[PDB]
Amino acid sequence: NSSKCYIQVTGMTCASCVANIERNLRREEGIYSILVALMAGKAEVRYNPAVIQPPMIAEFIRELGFGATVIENIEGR
Numbered sequence: 001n002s003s004k005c006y007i008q009v010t011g012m013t014c015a016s017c018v019a020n021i022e023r024n025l026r027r028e029e030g031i032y033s034i035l036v037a038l039m040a041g042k043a044e045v046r047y048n049p050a051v052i053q054p055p056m057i058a059e060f061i062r063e064l065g066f067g068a069t070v071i072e073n074i075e076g077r
């Protein structure tokens, strides 16, 4: 079933961006949860990688939004 990946957006607390991004994503294209975690300062989309593609789901966010660095991992303290 649908898995997730993390994505760092170049300007999380721009604001509005994220409302738009919910509107972009929850439309369609293999998503079964949107990213957002602007509260921390990042994105975590839950999707299927077959329809859209892991590069593609990140990459798309560049052209309409902002620099979207993909992170198929999470670690820190």
Ligand SMILES: [Cu+2]
Pocket: 014, 015, 016, 017, 018
């Ligand atoms: Cu913005």
